[PDB]
């Protein structure tokens, strides 16, 4: 079970620094190169640099030698990337991945990846969301089913995660991407289509989790009146 | 620095049909018979996944529907037959020289049969109205193709400039989209009007569909 | 035509035991790496501080070609920062190593029917090797408080142990020939270059 694990998100102030971790397990950490890659929202991938955990030799993209410093801690099987003097242009997802470096085999192929650390560079304060019901309508079987949901509003930074009924309701759930409002806060809706008959019999609860503010809201959604 | 250019930028293909994505290198990536080109598949919100290494070698666990070919400057990833869960962006990478560089990506969309949206409208909750802002939401569920028009009408007047749309990624199983349109008003403005409606135009609807409510459940 | 004598190292009829690893100093020549790139034998070809594709474009003050035989599941120890019997007691690369490690299966040459026992490694040592140290001592290893007086006994072991290379063994326990090319850049003028 080869695994590379990265923290999901970081919020860091402009001009400050951030240090991100990539915890390796399921293989011998010091025999594979670790590489780091940048992906700005909606864009392609950009190579930052590589480190060989046995002895710590590094190789840097010339674009990033002033921005990034790669280290490892072999005792913990953890690789780190430090980014310095952050600007808004450094807001992005940073991936770690491994390659074996064998010229007659996989060579630079990245067969295993961490799931990325999403870095937001902002001076704004952390704000937990307000969760409001999108109540099902009394009119029955439009489209053959009823719809209901949660409006998750006025939170910062991303991300928020939504589940329904603690993860027991997964069918027909649609969680929209967050939109950045003019206020500088994020907003998101999560909806689910359910049988119109089940409106009385079944309780629907959206579970909203905003880890950056350590907020968890469980909001029951009921027909109005 | 080798520049890799991927075409098409976007591509729509039906189930069972063939998708061919091309990668063009500003310089040859051939070294002693090897083409150091790699292909990755990235589904939204996830790390890229290795598909092909050394331009034609399939990574273990990857279906043979994926194939890589080409030499020197021109390379191709082929998906035949295309399936529903192939919705992703596809990237090429070169490693003949440093810095290793990636192409800009090719986004693959599944063409399926037309499907009309199911339309629902949601009034603002009373809890939100206590804060002084009212959000009215219109939901278009499980539709294809992506093009849809959502028009907000307040007391029968078309409203523009105070609404925002968000769309999901194409569903990995049924290949539909879903869309929210949110109309934002101050509490005072919301309370000045009675009829709230959203009207949806879409290729799957023989004529536009309107969902509405009267403020205060009138 | 003054080609660096890679064939003398890679294709030498005899290879050394890893505890007595051989070193060939290479200088004043043009190194044609094509012969390495065009070889289908190599199972390991890993470079550090240098790129495998860029070798023909680079110039070095000196090249050392170190060679020896180990078993296959030990080739992973021939790399910077490694631990284990081979890396600690037989052949150690520094953290800042600059060069390439090349290995290929040599079962057809270095095994024989009753087993080949002429290849050995150091099993016991009082301290780890320093990088690029070659220890050929056969002195009895004192594992306990009792002195050994040159004689094997209860806590007194001969420090070397034979590989038993059986032709029918699995690949993890088959012999692999290894060449380690180290490229040293000094401030002195360069003597070894690939075809630029
Ligand atoms: C250890 O010993 C073994 C056995 O003795 C050695 O193995 C032999 O190695 C040679 C290579 O050194 C192999 O044979 C030839 O490889 C030649 C290399 O080809 C290049 O150069 C030629 C002349 O310049 C040319 O014909 C050829 O043209 C090709 O490439 C061009 C550029 O890409 C292209 O335009 C042409 O159209 C063409 O495709 C190359 O430029 C070649 O001349 C021969 O055809 C053959 O391939 C042997 O097969 C190996 N034999 C075995 C049994 O393995 C080994 O190298 C030794 N190791 C060391 C370290 O010395």
Tokens of C187: 């401030």
Distance C100 CA to ligand 1 centre (A): 21
Is A58 part of the contact surface with chain B (CB cutoff 8 Å)?
A: no
Closest alpha carbon to B94 in B128, B55, B44, B57: B55
Distance C60 CA to ligand 1 centre (A): 25
| Cβ A75 vs Cβ A150: under 8 Å | no
Count CB atoms within 10 A of the CB of residue B63.
Answer: 11
Count CB atoms within 10 A of the CB of residue C115.
Answer: 13
Closest alpha carbon to B124 in C56, A153, C193: A153
Q: Are residues C99 and C154 in the same domain?
A: no
Tokens of B179: 């869309």
CB pair distance less than 8 Å for C45 and A102: yes
| Cβ A57 vs Cβ C51: under 8 Å | no
Total domains in the fold of chain C? 2
Q: Which helix (H) or strand (E) holds C64?
A: strand C62-71
| Cβ B47 vs Cβ A97: under 8 Å | yes
CA distance B192 to B185: 10
CA distance A154 to A149: 17
Distance C35 CA to ligand 1 centre (A): 7
Q: Are residues C20 and C100 in the same domain?
A: yes
Q: Are residues C17 and C103 in the same domain?
A: yes
Q: Are residues C35 and C123 in the same domain?
A: no
Q: Are residues C103 and C187 in the same domain?
A: yes
Q: Which helix (H) or strand (E) holds A199?
A: helix A198-201
CB pair distance less than 8 Å for B118 and A224: no
Q: Are β-strands B66-71 and B74-79 bridged in parallel, bridged antiparallel, or unpaired?
A: antiparallel
Q: Are β-strands B10-14 and B106-111 bridged in parallel, bridged antiparallel, or unpaired?
A: parallel
Q: Are residues C54 and C72 in the same domain?
A: yes
Total domains in the fold of chain A? 2
The SS3 call for residue A156 is strand
Tokens of B26: 């500003």
What Å resolution does this PDB entry report?
A: 2.2
User: Which of A93, A121, A149 is a domain's end point?
Assistant: A121
CA distance C62 to C181: 10
Residue ranges around ligand 1 (CB below 6 Å):
C 6-7, 10-11, 35, 38
User: How many CA within 13 A on the CB side of residue B81?
Assistant: 6
Residues 6+ apart with CB under 8 A from C122: C19, C85, C89, C90, C135, C159, C160, C161
Tokens of A170: 């997964």
Q: Is B29 left (phi over 0), alpha (psi -120 to 50) or beta?
A: alpha
CA distance A217 to C69: 64
CA distance A56 to A73: 9
| Cβ C161 vs Cβ C60: under 8 Å | no
A-contacting residues of B 129-148, CB under 8 Å? Answer: 131, 135, 137, 139, 141
B4-111 matches B118-214 in fold: yes
Length reported for chain A? 225
| Cβ B54 vs Cβ B121: under 8 Å | no
Ligand 1 pocket mutation, candidates C11, C32, C33, criterion most atoms within 8 A of CB: C11
CA distance A174 to A142: 18
Compare CB distances from A47 to B99, B119, B164 and report the shortest one's residue: B99
Count CB atoms within 10 A of the CB of residue A62.
Answer: 10
Q: Are residues C194 and C121 in the same domain?
A: no
Closest alpha carbon to A35 in A91, A83, A100, A126: A100
| Cβ A210 vs Cβ A129: under 8 Å | yes
CA distance A189 to C176: 60
What are residue A189's DSSP bridge partners?
Answer: A151
Q: Are residues C144 and C173 in the same domain?
A: no
| Best residue in C46, C76, C93 for a mutation probing chain A (most A CBs within 10 Å) | C46
Contact residues, chain A, for C52 at CB < 8 Å:
103
Is A225 part of the contact surface with chain B (CB cutoff 8 Å)?
A: yes
Which atom belonging to ligand 1 lies closest to the Cα atom of C11? 1
Q: Where are the beta strands (DSSP E) in chain A?
A: 3-5, 9-12, 18-25, 33-39, 45-52, 57-60, 68-73, 78-83, 92-99, 112-113, 117-121, 130-134, 146-155, 161-164, 173-175, 179-180, 186-194, 204-210, 215-221
CB pair distance less than 8 Å for B32 and C37: yes
What are residue A164's DSSP bridge partners?
Answer: A169, A206
Contact residues, chain C, for B97 at CB < 8 Å:
51, 53-54
CA distance B48 to A4: 13
- The CA distances from residue A5 to A99, A182, B37, in Å, are 15, 34, 26
Closest alpha carbon to B54 in B71, B41, B74, B66: B71
Q: Which CATH class is domain B118-214?
A: mainly beta
Sign of CA dihedral C124, C126, C129, C133: negative
Q: Are residues C155 and C184 in the same domain?
A: no
Angle CA B12–B13–B16, to nearest 5? 165
CA distance B154 to B197: 6
CA distance B49 to B42: 6
Structural determination approach:
X-ray
CB pair distance less than 8 Å for B32 and C38: yes
Distance, C-alpha A15 to centroid of its chain: 23
Its domain, for residue C121, covers 115-166
Q: Are residues A79 and A135 in the same domain?
A: no
Q: Are residues A47 and A116 in the same domain?
A: yes
Full DSSP string of chain B:
---EEEE-SEEEEETTS-EEEEEEESS--EETTEE-EEEEEE-TTS--EEEEETTTEEPTTS-TTEEEEEETTEEEEEESS--GGG-EEEEEEE-SSSSPEE---EEEEEE---BPPEEEEEPPPHHHHHTTEEEEEEEEEEEBSS--EEEEEETTEEE-SSEEEEEPPPPTTT--EEEEEEEEEEHHHHHT--EEEEEEE-TTSSS-EEEEEETTT-
Tokens of C180: 């380690």
Closest alpha carbon to C85 in C175, C19, C17, C178: C19
The SS3 call for residue C10 is helix
Contact residues, chain A, for C82 at CB < 8 Å:
30-31, 54
Its domain, for residue A193, covers 130-221
CA distance A219 to C12: 76
| Cβ A178 vs Cβ A156: under 8 Å | no
CA distance A29 to C79: 13
Chain A nearest CA to C96, separation (Å): 7
State residue A56 phi and psi, 5-degree precision.
75, 20
Q: Are residues A79 and A178 in the same domain?
A: no
What ranges in chain C are assigned the alpha helix state H? 6-10, 34-37, 85-89, 107-110
| Cβ C188 vs Cβ C115: under 8 Å | no
CA distance B155 to B213: 11
CA distance A53 to A59: 12
Q: Are residues C66 and C120 in the same domain?
A: no
CA distance A1 to A27: 8
Chain A nearest CA to B135, separation (Å): 9
Closest alpha carbon to B213 in A138, A200, A131, A133: A138
Q: Are residues A100 and A169 in the same domain?
A: no
User: Which of A65, A87, A121 is a domain's end point?
Assistant: A121
Q: Are residues A145 and A52 in the same domain?
A: no
Angle CA A117–A5–A185, to nearest 5? 25
Count CB atoms within 10 A of the CB of residue C97.
Answer: 25
Closest alpha carbon to B198 in B176, B167, B165: B165
Contact residues, chain A, for B137 at CB < 8 Å:
134, 149, 151, 189
Indicate the fold that domain B4-111 takes in CATH. Answer: Immunoglobulin-like (2.60.40)
CA distance B69 to B58: 11
How many CB pairs lie under 8 A apart between chains A and B? Answer: 131
Q: Are residues C110 and C128 in the same domain?
A: no
Nearest CA to ligand 1 atom 42: C38
Compare CB distances from B98 to C37, C38, C51 and report the shortest one's residue: C51
Q: Are residues C29 and C64 in the same domain?
A: yes
CB pair distance less than 8 Å for B53 and A109: yes
Is B98 part of the contact surface with chain C (CB cutoff 8 Å)?
A: yes
CA distance A12 to A92: 12
Q: Tell me the domain boundaries of chain B.
A: 4-111, 118-214
Contact residues, chain C, for B32 at CB < 8 Å:
34, 37-38
CA distance A93 to B28: 30
Which atom belonging to ligand 1 lies closest to the Cα atom of C7? 61
Q: Which helix (H) or strand (E) holds A172?
A: none
Cis peptide upstream of residue A159 (ω within 30 degrees of 0)? yes
| Cβ B86 vs Cβ B33: under 8 Å | no
């Amino acid at each position: 079970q080869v695994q590379l694990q990265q923290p999901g998100a970081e919020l860091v102030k402009p001009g400050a620094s951030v240090k991100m971790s990539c915890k390796a397990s399921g293989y011998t950490f010091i025999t594979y190169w670790i590489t780091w890659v940048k992906q700005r929202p909606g864009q392609g991938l950009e190579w930052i640099g590589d480190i060989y955990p046995g002895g710590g030799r590094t190789n840097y993209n010339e674009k990033f030698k002033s921005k990034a410093t790669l280290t490892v801690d072999t005792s913990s099987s953890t690789a780190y990337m430090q980014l310095r003097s952050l600007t808004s242009e450094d807001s992005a997802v940073y991936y770690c991945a491994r390659y074996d470096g064998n010229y007659v085999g996989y060579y630079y192929a990245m067969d295993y990846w961490g799931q990325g650390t999403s870095v937001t560079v902002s001076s704004a304060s952390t704000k937990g969301p307000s969760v409001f019901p999108l109540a099902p309508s009394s009119k029955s079987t439009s489209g053959g089913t009823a719809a209901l949901g949660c409006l998750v509003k006025d939170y910062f930074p991303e991300p928020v995660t939504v589940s329904w009924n603690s993860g027991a309701l997964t069918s027909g759930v649609h969680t929209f991407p967050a939109v950045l409002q003019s206020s500088g806060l994020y907003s998101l809706s999560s909806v689910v289509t359910v049988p119109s008959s089940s409106l009385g019999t079944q309780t629907y609860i959206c579970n909203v989790n905003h880890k950056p503010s350590n907020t968890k809201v469980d909001k029951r959604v009921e027909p109005k009146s | 620095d080798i520049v890799l250019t991927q075409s098409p930028v976007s591509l729509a293909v039906s189930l069972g049909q063939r998708a061919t994505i091309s990668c063009r290198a500003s310089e040859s990536v051939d070294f002693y018979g090897n083409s150091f080109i790699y292909w990755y598949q990235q589904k939204p919100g996830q790390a890229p996944k290795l598909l092909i290494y050394r331009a034609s070698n399939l990574e273990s666990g990857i279906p043979a529907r994926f194939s890589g070919s080409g030499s020197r400057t021109d390379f191709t990833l082929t998906i035949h037959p295309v399936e529903a869960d192939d919705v992703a962006t596809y990237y090429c990478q070169q490693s003949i020289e440093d810095p290793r560089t990636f192409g800009g990506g090719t986004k693959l969309e599944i063409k399926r049969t037309v499907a009309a949206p199911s339309v629902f409208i949601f009034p603002p909750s009373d809890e939100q109205l206590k804060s002084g802002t009212a959000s009215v939401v219109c939901l278009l569920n499980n539709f294809y193709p992506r093009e849809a028009k959502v028009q907000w009408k307040v007391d029968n007047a078309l409203q523009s400039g105070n609404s925002q749309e968000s769309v999901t990624e194409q569903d990995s199983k049924d290949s539909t989209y879903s869309l929210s349109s949110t109309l934002t008003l101050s509490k005072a403005d919301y309370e000045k009007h009675k009829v709230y409606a959203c009207e949806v135009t879409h290729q799957g609807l023989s004529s536009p569909v309107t969902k509405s409510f009267n403020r205060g459940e009138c | 035509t003054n080609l660096c004598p890679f064939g003398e190292v890679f294709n030498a009829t005899r290879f050394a035991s890893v505890y007595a690893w051989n070193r060939k100093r290479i200088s004043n020549c043009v190194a044609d790496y094509s012969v390495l790139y065009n070889s289908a034998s190599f199972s390991t070809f890993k470079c550090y501080g240098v790129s495998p594709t860029k070798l023909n474009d680079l110039c070095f003050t000196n090249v050392y070609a170190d060679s020896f035989v180990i078993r296959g599941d030990e080739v992973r120890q021939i790399a910077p920062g490694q631990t284990g019997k081979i890396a600690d007691y037989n052949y150690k690369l520094p953290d800042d190593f600059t060069g390439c490690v090349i290995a290929w299966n040599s079962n057809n040459l270095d095994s024989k029917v009753g087993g080949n026992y002429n290849y050995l490694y150091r099993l016991f040592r009082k301290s780890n090797l320093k990088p690029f140290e070659r220890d050929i001592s056969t002195e009895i290893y004192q594992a306990g408080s009792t002195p050994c007086n040159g004689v094997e006994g209860f806590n007194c072991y001969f420090p070397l142990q034979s590989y038993g290379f059986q032709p029918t063994n699995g690949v993890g326990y088959q012999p692999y020939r290894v060449v380690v090319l180290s490229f040293e850049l000094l401030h002195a003028p360069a003597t070894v270059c690939g075809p630029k």
